[PDB]
Design a protein around this ligand. Structure first.
Ligand SMILES: CCCCNC(=O)[C@H](C)C[C@H](O)[C@@H](N)C[C@H](Cc1ccc(OC)c(OCCCOC)c1)C(C)C
Length: 333
């Protein structure tokens, strides 16, 4: 076809990038993360008990105020790298950047506070494959694609640095005014998942890890670049960072000196300069700066896998190809 679309996203501390969709006729407006790490849509429900503090803090979906809603009813529990939300199915029309589809989503009535009370966004839009869709529910992209409207079965993400535009997705294409040089594609390893083959991580100058080929799931819904606890740990040893419970960190003076890390994808090497990965809010001997890499163990469903999140997409404009099943990288401008 010939439509092309984008949503515009807001960047929050570089750690959380959301855009907005509208469910229901009259629209209910919710804020959401467009995640390629999963494949289901959910937003909080009015039915959620406000004994859950998260619900008192996020907009909820009232469907009895929606003329288009449509009852469903099966339960559905979503598990993620880092939190579960439980709830039930339903349908109404959703509007993502001017394209309206009728999608089956989940109304969550169980939303745990941690980490939910810390999320600026209301829910999630999985841009994953049918395959990873819990409930075996068709996802937004496949439905949009059914409409016959895009010129291409492709969506791309721009994540900006921070403090105009926070980001931008474009459905049915790629804005050439946010990339440079050529795109470079990596074919999808199995299908029904955004996983690509990853050839080795270099810290500084040598493959400290990844060495016999590994998995890198490219995931827009994640904020940091992460790996198994076990290679994380190692990499960390190298760089010379500590643990803080959840994130490593280095002393700020040290900061603008940690070597570069590289990611070996398709004969090309994606290097991240030290600034790209440290969150430098100081340069002082006495203060701790944390890094934008983590440990995350994603289980055999798909993991173990390294996840390349926002840290990475923000440097390399990413296009995800449906028509052809692969992922291409280009340099963000
Ligand atoms: C159902 C199978 C799940 C498959 N995918 C995964 O497990 C991924 C590795 C992790 C998820 O994609 C995860 N990032 C999604 C995300 C989890 C999450 C929870 C709390 C957060 O805030 C403290 C958060 O921050 C996300 C920031 C994204 O901004 C771009 C993400 C929401 C949408 C559920």
């Amino acid at each position: 076809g010939n439509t092309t679309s984008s949503v515009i996203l807001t960047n929050y501390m570089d750690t959380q990038y959301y855009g907005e969709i509208g469910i229901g006729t009259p629209p209910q407006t919710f804020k959401v993360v467009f995640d390629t790490g999963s494949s289901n849509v959910w937003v909080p429900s009015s039915k959620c008990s406000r004994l859950y503090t998260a619900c008192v803090y996020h907009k909820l979906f009232d469907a009895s105020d929606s003329s288009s809603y449509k009852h469903n009813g099966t339960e559905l529990t979503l598990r993620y790298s880092t939190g579960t939300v439980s709830g039930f199915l339903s349908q109404d029309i959703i509007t993502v950047g001017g394209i309206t589809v009728t999608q089956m989503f989940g109304e969550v009535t169980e939303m745990p506070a941690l980490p939910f009370m810390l999320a600026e966004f209301d829910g999630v839009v999985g841009m994953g494959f049918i395959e990873q869709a819990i409930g075996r529910v068709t996802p937004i992209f496949d439905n949009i694609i059914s409409q016959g409207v895009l010129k291409e079965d492709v969506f791309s993400f721009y994540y900006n640095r921070d403090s105009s535009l926070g980001g931008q997705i474009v459905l049915g294409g790629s804005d050439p005014q946010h990339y440079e040089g050529n795109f470079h594609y990596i074919n999808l390893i199995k299908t029904g998942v955004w996983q690509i083959q990853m050839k080795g991580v270099s810290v500084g100058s040598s493959t400290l890890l990844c060495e016999d080929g590994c998995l890198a799931l490219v995931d827009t819904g994640a904020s940091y670049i992460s790996g198994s606890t076990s290679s994380i740990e190692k990499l960390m040893e190298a760089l010379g960072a500590k643990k803080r419970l959840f994130d490593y960190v280095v002393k700020c003076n040290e900061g603008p000196t940690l070597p570069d890390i590289s990611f070996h994808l398709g004969g090309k090497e994606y290097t991240l300069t030290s600034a790209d990965y440290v969150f430098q809010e100081s340069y002082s001997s006495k203060k701790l700066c944390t890094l934008a890499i983590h440990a995350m163990d994603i289980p055999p469903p798909t993991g173990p896998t390294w996840a390349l999140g926002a840290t990475f997409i923000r440097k390399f404009y990413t296009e995800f190809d449906r028509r052809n099943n692969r992922i291409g990288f280009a340099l963000a401008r």
